[PDB]
Amino acid sequence: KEIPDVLVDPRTMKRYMRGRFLGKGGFAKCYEITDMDTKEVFAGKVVPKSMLLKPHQKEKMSTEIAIHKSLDNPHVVGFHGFFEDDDFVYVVLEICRRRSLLELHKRRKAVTEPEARYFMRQTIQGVQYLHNNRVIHRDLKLGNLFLNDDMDVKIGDFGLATKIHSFEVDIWSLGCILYTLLVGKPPFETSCLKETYIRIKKNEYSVPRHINPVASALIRRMLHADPTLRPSVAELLTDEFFTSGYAPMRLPTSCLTVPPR
Numbered sequence: 001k002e003i004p005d006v007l008v009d010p011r012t013m014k015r016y017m018r019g020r021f022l023g024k025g026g027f028a029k030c031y032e033i034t035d036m037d038t039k040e041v042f043a044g045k046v047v048p049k050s051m052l053l054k055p056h057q058k059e060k061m062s063t064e065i066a067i068h069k070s071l072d073n074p075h076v077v078g079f080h081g082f083f084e085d086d087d088f089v090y091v092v093l094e095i096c097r098r099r100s101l102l103e104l105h106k107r108r109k110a111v112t113e114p115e116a117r118y119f120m121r122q123t124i125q126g127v128q129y130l131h132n133n134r135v136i137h138r139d140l141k142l143g144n145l146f147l148n149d150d151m152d153v154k155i156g157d158f159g160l161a162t163k164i165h166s167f168e169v170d171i172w173s174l175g176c177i178l179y180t181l182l183v184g185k186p187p188f189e190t191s192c193l194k195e196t197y198i199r200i201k202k203n204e205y206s207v208p209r210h211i212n213p214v215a216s217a218l219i220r221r222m223l224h225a226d227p228t229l230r231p232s233v234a235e236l237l238t239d240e241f242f243t244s245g246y247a248p249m250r251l252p253t254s255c256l257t258v259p260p261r
């Protein structure tokens, strides 16, 4: 079943031209779409109705949309209306041309401390907005921290997001991201998936000694076994880690491949 070259919706009655392929996720596939009138460029998440043949699965996406729809923040992927024909459900989104922070981590391994400061700040600032509006992401990873042409972090993929474990699980994930960014490998990463779940449950990780004491301290508190002892979102920004060392306000695109100078 072919995805139409042009995508029109009943509501806004605008025409979206399906352009270059961008990636995929599970059953969903993403293409760069262009508004044929305004020429504005968007990322079109295309989901086939055949994957949502079961009404239960058709709820998971309508929840995701209802949460993403309500959102407006310079650090969360912009929502720009959704729609459907008989075959596909189309979600029009903000275009992040520099892929995700995962691609960066893969290409870069362990990034520099100022880079982690910049990347974390912007991510935490987005997570704050979410938490303030009573939204928990629940599925935060480097692949969900997208990047645009100005290297701005934009949180996406609200597939497991909920509205009110609680807010403290998102602090946990952020502790993992900070770990991975500074260390260069995920803290509970193993070949075997079952082993990872054991590592998480037993709280088995170890920050190498090569990492900054102040940085390792923050990580540890973020990854604390007692969810009530993990820091709050507001408490993260003000941590010594962000305020003591050098923190750039901008990052070059070169950061996708090599450390900045």
Ligand SMILES: C[C@H](Nc1cc2c(-c3cc(Cl)cc(CCCO)c3)noc2cn1)c1ccccc1
Pocket (backbone or CB within 6 Å): 022, 023, 024, 025, 028, 029, 030, 043, 045, 046, 077, 093, 094, 095, 096, 097, 098, 099, 100, 143, 144, 146, 156, 157
């Ligand atoms: C370059 C492009 N840009 C881009 C991609 C998106 C997506 C998206 C949708 C789906 Cl079904 C799958 C993926 C792949 C990643 C696996 O999760 C992303 N939604 O919104 C966007 C805004 N921009 C981009 C490509 C790969 C990773 C990341 C960003």
